[PDB]
Amino acid sequence: DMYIERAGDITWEKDAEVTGNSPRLDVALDESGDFSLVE
Amino acid sequence: GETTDGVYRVMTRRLLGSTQVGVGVMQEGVFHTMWHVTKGAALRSGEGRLDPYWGDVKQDLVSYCGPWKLDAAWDGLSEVQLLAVPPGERAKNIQTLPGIFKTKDGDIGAVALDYPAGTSGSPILDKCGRVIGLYGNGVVIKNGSYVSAITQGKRE
Numbered sequence: 001d002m003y004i005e006r007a008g009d010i011t012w013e014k015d016a017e018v019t020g021n022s023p024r025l026d027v028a029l030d031e032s033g034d035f036s037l038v039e
Numbered sequence: 040g041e042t043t044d045g046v047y048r049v050m051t052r053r054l055l056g057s058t059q060v061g062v063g064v065m066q067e068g069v070f071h072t073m074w075h076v077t078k079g080a081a082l083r084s085g086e087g088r089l090d091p092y093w094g095d096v097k098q099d100l101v102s103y104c105g106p107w108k109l110d111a112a113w114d115g116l117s118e119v120q121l122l123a124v125p126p127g128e129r130a131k132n133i134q135t136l137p138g139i140f141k142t143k144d145g146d147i148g149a150v151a152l153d154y155p156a157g158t159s160g161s162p163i164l165d166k167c168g169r170v171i172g173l174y175g176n177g178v179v180i181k182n183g184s185y186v187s188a189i190t191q192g193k194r195e
């Protein structure tokens with residue numbers, strides 16, 4: 001049996017840690033909800 | 040039990056100790072998470088029981104106690120914030136500019152951040168704090184890293 005626990009408020013916070021690239025990828029989604037990189 | 044709006048951890052006691060399996064969002068009496076996190080199983084909030092209401096294996100989404108309530112969307116231009124709730128670690132807003140997942144059905148947003156699989160279900164937020172999708176379903180790139188899509192449901 002799974003259970004839930006509160007982790008916090010959903011708010012946008014200023015001066016947050018800004019990181020990460022923005023890549024454009026050609027993908028395919030199957031009937032099982034699994035994505036795959038297509039080339 | 041606790042039906043307060045906010046981000047929540049999904050945990051299981053089936054294995055050794057208490058293992059986090061994912062994250063979710065309580066919004067308007069409805070708990071929203073990714074399908075692969077729970078697999079449609081009933082969750083529990085203290086003494087209370089959350090039963091699945093809607094679920095789709097292709098959308099990879101599942102709602103509890105009612106229909107899907109998150110309807111906001113990425114604008115294609117603005118930087119977003121992933122409210123990352125990692126296993127054993129404190130919640131954290133991480134600002135990033137998303138990329139694009141080009142598909143035969145249309146383009147989707149994509150956050151490229153390196154987090155454990157147990158972080159699946161964390162809300163991706165806009166500058167207004169609204170939930171524009173969930174983190175946890177995407178692809179594995181040449182570097183072994185994960186690039187998750189911005190998965191939003193449909194409000195009826």
Ligand SMILES: O=C(Nc1ccc2c(c1)CNC2)c1ccc2ncsc2c1
Nearest residue numbers: 033034075099154155156159175176185
């Ligand atoms: O395995 C993952 N996700 C997943 C698993 C099983 C299924 C689906 C997605 C779609 N329906 C079947 C995963 C792996 C790494 C990771 N790192 C951050 S979030 C994250 C998710």
